Coordinates of N, CA, C and O in Angstrom, one line a residue:
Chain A
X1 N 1.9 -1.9 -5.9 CA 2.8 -0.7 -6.1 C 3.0 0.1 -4.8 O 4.2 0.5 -4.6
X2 N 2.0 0.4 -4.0 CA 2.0 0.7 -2.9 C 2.7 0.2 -1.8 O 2.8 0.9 -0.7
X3 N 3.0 -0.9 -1.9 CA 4.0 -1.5 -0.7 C 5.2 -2.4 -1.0 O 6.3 -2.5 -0.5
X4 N 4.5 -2.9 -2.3 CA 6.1 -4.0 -2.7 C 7.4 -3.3 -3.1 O 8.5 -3.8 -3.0
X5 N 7.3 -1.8 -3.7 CA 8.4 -0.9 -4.2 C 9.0 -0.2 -2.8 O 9.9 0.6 -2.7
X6 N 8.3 -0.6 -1.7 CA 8.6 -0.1 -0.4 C 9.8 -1.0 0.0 O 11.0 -0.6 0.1
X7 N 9.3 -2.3 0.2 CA 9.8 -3.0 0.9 C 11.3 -3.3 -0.4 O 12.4 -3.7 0.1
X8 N 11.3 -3.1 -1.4 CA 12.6 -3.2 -2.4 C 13.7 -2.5 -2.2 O 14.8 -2.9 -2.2
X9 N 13.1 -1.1 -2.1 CA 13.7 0.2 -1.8 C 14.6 -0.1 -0.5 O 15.9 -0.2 -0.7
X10 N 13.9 -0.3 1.0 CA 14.3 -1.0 2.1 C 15.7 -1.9 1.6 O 16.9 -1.4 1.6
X11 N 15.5 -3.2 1.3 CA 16.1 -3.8 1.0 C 16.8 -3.4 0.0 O 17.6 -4.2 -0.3
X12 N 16.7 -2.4 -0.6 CA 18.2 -2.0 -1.7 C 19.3 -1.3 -0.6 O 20.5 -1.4 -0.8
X13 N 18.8 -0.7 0.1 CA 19.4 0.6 1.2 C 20.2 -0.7 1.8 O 21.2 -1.1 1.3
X14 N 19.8 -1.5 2.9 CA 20.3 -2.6 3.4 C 21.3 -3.6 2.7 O 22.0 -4.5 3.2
X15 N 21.1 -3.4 1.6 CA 21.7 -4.2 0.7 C 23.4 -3.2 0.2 O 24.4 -3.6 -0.2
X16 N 23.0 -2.1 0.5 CA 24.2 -0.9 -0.2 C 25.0 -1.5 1.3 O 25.7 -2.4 1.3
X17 N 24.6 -0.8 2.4 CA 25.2 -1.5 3.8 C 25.7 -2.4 3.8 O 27.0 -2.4 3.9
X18 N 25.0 -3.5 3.7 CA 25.6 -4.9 4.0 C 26.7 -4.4 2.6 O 27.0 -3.4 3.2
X19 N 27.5 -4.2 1.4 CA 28.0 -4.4 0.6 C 29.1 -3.3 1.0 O 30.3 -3.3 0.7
X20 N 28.4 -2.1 1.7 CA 29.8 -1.2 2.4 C 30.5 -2.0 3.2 O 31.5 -1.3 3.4
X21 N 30.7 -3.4 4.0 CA 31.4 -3.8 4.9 C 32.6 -4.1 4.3 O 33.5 -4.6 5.0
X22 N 33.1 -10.5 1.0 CA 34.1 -9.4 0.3 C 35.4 -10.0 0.9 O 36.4 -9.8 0.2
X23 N 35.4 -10.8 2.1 CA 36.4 -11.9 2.1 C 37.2 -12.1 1.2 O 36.6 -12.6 0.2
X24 N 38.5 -11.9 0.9 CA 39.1 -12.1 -0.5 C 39.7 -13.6 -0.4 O 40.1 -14.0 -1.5
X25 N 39.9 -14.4 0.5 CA 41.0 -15.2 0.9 C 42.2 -14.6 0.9 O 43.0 -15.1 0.1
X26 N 42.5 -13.7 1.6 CA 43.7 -12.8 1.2 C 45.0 -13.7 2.5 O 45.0 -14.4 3.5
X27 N 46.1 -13.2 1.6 CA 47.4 -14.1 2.5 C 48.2 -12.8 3.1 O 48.4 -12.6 4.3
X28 N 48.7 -11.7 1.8 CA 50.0 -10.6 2.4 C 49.0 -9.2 3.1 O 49.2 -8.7 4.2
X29 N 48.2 -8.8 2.2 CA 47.4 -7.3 2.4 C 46.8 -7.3 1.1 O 47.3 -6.4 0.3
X30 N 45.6 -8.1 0.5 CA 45.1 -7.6 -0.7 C 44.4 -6.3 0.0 O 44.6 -5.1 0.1
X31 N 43.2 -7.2 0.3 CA 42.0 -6.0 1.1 C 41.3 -5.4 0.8 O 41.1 -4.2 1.3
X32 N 40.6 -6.0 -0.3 CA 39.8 -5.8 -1.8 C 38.8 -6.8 -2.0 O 38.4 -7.6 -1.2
X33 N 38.6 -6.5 -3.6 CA 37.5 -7.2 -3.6 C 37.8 -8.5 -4.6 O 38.8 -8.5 -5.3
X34 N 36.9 -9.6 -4.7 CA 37.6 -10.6 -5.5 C 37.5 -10.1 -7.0 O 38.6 -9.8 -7.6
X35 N 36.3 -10.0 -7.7 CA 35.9 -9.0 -8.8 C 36.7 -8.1 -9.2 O 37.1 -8.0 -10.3
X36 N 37.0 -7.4 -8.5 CA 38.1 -6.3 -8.2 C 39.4 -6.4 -9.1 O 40.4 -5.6 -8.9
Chain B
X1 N 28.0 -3.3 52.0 CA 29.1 -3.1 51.3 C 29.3 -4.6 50.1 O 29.6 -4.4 48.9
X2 N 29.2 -5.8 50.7 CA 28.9 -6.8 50.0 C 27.9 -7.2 49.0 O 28.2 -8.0 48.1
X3 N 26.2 -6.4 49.2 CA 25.3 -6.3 48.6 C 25.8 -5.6 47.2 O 25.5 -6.1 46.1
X4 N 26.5 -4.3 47.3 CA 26.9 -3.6 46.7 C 28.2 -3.8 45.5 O 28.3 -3.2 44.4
X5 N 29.0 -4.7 46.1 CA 30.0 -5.2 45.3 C 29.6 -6.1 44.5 O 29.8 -5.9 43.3
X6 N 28.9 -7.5 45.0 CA 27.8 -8.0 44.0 C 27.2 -7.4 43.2 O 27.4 -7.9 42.1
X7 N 26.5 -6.6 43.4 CA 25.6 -5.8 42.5 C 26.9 -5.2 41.1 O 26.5 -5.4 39.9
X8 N 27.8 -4.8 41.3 CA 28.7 -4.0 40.3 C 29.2 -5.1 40.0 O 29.5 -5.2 38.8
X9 N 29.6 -6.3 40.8 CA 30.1 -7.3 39.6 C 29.4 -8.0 38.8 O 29.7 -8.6 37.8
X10 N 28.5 -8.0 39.3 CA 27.0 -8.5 38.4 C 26.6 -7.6 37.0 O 26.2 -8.0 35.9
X11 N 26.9 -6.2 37.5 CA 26.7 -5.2 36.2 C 27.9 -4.9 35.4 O 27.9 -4.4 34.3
X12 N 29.0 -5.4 36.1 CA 30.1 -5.5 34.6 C 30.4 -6.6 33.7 O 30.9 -6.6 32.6
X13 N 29.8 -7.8 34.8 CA 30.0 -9.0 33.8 C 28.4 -9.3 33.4 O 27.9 -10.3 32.9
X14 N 27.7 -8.1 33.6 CA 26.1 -8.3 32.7 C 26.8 -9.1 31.3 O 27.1 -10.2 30.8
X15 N 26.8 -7.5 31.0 CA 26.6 -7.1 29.3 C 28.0 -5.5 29.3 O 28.0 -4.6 28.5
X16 N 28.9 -5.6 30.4 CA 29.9 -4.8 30.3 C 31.0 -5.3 29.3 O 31.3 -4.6 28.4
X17 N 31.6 -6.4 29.5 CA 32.7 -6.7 29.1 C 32.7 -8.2 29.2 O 33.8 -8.8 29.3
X18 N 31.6 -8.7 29.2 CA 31.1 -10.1 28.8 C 32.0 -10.6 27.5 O 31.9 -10.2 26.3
X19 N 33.2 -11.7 28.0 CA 33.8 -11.9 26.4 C 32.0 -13.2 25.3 O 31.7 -13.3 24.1
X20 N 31.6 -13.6 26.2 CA 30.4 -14.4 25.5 C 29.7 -13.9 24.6 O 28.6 -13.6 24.9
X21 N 30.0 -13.7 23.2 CA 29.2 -13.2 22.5 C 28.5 -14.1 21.4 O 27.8 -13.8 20.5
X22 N 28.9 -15.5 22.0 CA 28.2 -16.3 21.2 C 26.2 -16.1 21.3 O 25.4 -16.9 20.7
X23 N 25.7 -15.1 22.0 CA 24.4 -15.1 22.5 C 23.9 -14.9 20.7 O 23.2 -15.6 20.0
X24 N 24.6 -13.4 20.2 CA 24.8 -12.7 19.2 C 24.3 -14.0 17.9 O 23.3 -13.9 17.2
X25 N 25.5 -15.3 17.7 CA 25.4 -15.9 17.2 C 24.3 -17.1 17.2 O 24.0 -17.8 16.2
X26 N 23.9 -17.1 18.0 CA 22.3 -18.2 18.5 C 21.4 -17.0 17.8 O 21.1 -17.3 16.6
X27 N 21.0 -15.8 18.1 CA 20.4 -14.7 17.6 C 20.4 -14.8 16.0 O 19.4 -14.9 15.3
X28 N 21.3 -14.9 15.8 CA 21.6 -14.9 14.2 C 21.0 -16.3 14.0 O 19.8 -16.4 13.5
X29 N 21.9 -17.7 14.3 CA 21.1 -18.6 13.9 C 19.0 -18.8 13.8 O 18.1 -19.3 13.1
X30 N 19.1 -18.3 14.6 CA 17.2 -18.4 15.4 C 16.5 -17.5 14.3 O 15.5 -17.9 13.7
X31 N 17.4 -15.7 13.7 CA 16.1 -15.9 12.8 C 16.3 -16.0 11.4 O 15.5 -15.5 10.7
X32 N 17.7 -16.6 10.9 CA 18.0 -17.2 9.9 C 17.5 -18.5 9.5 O 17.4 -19.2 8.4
X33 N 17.1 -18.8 11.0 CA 15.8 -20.1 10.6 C 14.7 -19.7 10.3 O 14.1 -20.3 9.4
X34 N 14.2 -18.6 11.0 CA 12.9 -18.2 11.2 C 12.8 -17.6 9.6 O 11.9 -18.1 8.9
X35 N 13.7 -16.5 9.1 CA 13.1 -16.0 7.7 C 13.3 -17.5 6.5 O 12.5 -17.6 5.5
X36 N 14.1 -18.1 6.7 CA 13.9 -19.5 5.7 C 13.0 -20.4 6.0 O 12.5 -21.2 5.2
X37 N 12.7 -20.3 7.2 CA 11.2 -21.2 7.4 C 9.7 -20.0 6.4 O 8.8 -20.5 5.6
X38 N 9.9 -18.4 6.8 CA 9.1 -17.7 5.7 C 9.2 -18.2 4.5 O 8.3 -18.8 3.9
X39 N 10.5 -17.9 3.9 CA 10.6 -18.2 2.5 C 10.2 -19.1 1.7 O 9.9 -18.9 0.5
X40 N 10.2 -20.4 2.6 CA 10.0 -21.4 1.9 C 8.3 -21.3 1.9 O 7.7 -21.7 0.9
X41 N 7.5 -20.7 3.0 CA 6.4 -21.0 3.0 C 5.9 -20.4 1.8 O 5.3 -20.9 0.9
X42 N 6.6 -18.9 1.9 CA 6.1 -18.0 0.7 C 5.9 -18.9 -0.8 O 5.0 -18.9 -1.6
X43 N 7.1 -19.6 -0.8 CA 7.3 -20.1 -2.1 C 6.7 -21.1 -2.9 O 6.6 -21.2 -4.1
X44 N 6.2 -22.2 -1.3 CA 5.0 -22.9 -1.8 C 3.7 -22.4 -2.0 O 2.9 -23.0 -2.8
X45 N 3.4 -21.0 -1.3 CA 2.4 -20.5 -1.4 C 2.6 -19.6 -3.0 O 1.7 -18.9 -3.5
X46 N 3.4 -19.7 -3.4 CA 3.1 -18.8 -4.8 C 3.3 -19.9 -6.1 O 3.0 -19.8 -7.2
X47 N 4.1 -21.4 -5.1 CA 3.6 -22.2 -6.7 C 2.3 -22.8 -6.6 O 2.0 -23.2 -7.7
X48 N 1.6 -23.1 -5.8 CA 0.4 -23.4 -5.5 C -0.7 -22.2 -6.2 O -1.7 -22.6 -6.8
X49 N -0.6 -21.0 -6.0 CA -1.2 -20.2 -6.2 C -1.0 -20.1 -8.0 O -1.9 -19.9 -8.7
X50 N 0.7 -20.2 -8.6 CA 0.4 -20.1 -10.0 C 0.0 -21.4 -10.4 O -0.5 -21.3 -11.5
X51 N 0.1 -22.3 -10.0 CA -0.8 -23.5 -10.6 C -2.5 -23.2 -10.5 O -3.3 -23.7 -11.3
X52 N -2.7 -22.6 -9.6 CA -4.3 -22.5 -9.7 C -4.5 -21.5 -10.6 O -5.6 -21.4 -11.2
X53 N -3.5 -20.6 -10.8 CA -4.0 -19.4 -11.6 C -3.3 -19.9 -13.3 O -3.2 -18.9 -14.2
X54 N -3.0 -20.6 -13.6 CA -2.9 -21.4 -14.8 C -4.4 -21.9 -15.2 O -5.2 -21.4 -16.0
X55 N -4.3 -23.2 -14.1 CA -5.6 -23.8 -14.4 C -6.6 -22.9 -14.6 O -7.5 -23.2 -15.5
X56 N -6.8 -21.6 -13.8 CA -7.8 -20.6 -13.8 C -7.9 -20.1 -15.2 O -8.9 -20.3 -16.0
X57 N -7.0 -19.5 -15.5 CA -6.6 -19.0 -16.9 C -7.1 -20.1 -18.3 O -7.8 -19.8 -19.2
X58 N -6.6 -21.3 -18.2 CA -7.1 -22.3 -19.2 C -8.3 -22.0 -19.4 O -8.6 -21.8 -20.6
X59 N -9.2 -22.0 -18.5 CA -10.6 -21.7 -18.3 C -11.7 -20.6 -18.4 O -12.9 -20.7 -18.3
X60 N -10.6 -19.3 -18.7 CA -11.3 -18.3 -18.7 C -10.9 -17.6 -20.1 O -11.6 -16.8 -20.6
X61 N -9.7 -17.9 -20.6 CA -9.7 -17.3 -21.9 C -10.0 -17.8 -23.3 O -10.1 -17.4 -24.5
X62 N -10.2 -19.2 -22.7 CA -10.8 -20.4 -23.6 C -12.3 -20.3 -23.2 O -13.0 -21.3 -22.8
X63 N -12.8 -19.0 -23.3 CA -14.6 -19.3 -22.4 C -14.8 -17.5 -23.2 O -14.2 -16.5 -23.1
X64 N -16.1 -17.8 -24.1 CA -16.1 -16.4 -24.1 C -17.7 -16.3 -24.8 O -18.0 -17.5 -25.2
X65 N -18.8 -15.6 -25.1 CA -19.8 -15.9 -25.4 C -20.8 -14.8 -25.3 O -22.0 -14.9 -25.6
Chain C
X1 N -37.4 -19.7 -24.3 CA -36.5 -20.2 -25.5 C -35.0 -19.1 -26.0 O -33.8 -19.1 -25.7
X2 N -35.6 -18.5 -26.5 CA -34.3 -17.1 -27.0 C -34.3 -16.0 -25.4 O -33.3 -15.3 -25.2
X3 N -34.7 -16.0 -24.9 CA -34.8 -15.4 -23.5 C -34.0 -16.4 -22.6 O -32.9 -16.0 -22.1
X4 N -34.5 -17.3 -22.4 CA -33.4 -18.2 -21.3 C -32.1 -18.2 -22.3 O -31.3 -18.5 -21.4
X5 N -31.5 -18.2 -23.3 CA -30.3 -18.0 -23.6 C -29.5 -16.9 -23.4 O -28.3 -16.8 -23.2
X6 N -30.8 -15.6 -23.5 CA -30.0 -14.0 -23.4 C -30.0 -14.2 -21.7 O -29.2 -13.3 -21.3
X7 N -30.4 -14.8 -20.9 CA -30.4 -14.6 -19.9 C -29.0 -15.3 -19.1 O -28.4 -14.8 -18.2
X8 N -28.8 -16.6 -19.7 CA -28.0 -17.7 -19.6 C -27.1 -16.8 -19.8 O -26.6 -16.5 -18.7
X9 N -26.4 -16.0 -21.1 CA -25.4 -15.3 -21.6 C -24.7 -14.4 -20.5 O -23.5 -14.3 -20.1
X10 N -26.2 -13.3 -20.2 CA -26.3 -12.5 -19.5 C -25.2 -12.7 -17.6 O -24.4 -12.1 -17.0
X11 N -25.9 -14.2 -17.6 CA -25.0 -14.8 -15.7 C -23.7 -15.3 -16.6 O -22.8 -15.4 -15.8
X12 N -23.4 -15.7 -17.8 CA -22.0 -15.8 -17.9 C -21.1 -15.0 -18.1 O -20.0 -15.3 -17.9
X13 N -21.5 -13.6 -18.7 CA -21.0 -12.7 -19.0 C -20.4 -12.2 -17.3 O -19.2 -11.9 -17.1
X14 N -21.4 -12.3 -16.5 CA -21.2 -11.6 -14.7 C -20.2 -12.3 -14.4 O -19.1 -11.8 -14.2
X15 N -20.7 -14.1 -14.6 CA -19.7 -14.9 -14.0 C -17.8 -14.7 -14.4 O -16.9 -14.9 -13.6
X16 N -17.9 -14.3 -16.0 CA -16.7 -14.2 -16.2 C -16.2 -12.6 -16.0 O -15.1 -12.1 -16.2
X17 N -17.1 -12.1 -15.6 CA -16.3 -10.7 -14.9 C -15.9 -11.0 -13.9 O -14.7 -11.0 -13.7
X18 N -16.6 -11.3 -13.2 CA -16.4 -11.4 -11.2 C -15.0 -12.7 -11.8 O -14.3 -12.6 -10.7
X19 N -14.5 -13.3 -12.3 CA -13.9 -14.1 -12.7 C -12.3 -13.7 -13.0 O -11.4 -14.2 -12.4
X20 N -12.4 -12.6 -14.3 CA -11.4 -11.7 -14.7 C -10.8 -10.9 -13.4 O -9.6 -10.8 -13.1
X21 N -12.0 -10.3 -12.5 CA -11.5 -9.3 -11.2 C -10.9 -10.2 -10.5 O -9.7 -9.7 -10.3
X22 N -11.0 -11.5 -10.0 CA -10.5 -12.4 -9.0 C -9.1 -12.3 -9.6 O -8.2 -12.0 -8.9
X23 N -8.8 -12.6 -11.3 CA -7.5 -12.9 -11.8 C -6.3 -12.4 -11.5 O -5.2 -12.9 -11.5
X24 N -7.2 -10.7 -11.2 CA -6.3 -9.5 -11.2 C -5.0 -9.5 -10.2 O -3.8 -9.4 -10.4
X25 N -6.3 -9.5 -8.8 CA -5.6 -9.6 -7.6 C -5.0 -10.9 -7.3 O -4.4 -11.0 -6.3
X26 N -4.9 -11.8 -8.1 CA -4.5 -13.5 -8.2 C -3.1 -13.1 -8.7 O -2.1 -13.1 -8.0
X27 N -3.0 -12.7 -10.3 CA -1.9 -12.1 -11.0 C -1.0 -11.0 -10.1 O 0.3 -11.1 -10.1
X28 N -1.8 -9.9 -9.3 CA -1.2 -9.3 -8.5 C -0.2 -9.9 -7.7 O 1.0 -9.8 -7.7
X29 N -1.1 -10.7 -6.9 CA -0.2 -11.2 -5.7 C 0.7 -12.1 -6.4 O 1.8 -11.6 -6.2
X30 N 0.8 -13.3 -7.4 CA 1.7 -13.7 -7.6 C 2.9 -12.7 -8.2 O 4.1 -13.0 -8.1
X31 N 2.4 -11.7 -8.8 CA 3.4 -11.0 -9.3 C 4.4 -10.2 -8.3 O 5.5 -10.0 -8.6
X32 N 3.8 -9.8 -7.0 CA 4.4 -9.5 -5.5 C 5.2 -9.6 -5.3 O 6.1 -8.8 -5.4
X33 N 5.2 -11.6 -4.8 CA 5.4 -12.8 -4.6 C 6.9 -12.7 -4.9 O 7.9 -12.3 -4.1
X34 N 6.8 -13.1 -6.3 CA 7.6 -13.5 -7.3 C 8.9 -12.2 -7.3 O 10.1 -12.4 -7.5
X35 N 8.1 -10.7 -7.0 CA 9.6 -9.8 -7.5 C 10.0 -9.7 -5.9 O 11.2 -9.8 -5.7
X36 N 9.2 -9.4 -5.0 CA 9.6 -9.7 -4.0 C 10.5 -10.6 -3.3 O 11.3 -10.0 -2.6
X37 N 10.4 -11.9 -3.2 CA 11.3 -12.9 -2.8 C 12.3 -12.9 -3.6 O 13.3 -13.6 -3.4
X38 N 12.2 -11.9 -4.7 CA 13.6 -12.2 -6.3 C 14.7 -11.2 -5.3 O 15.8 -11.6 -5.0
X39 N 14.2 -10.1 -4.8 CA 15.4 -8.9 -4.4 C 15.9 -9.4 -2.9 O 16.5 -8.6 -2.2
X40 N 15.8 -10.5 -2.5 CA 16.6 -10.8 -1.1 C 18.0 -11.2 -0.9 O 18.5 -12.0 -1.7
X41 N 18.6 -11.0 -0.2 CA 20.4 -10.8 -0.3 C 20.5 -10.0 -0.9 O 21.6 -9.6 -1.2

């Protein structure tokens, strides 16, 4: 409890980051998401 | 004067405006090995560990007296 | 006779504590393990 909810937390924050930057294969201007 | 111009072309083609940025991508490859070489250890290490803690279990909740 | 069995009982009762404690931190760490390597990427 003491360290594994640490290291999650960590990696959720880094994980928001990496997902603020998703490739669409885009051709005219999508520039979005595929999901999307 | 020569010592000197050396020196400044040496420090802009350090890491000034170096187009080489493949160093970046070696970096990336090196420890995208290195945490998959972890992972996988982790992974043998925790099915080894639930197999013993199976076996362990078979043994201890079937044991009572 | 009835004494070496309460006694016998007695070291298996220990044995299966010290037994159960080991499980804990056993169950622990695999439980770690397991949610730990789950949240990567």
């Amino acid at each position: 409890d003491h360290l594994y909810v640490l290291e999650h937390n960590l990696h959720l924050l880094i994980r928001e980051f990496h997902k603020q930057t998703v490739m669409p294969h885009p051709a005219s201007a999508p520039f979005g998401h595929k999901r999307m | 004067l020569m010592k000197l111009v050396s020196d400044l072309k040496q420090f802009l083609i350090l890491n000034d405006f170096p187009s080489v940025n493949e160093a970046i991508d070696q970096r990336n490859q090196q420890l995208r090995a290195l945490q998959e070489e972890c992972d996988r250890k982790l992974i043998t290490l925790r099915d080894e560990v639930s197999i013993d803690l199976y076996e362990l279990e078979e043994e201890y909740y079937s044991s009572s007296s | 006779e009835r004494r070496e069995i309460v006694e016998v009982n007695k070291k298996l009762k220990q044995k299966n504590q010290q037994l159960k404690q080991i499980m804990d931190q056993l169950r622990n760490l695999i439980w770690d393990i397991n949610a730990m390597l789950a949240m990567r990427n």
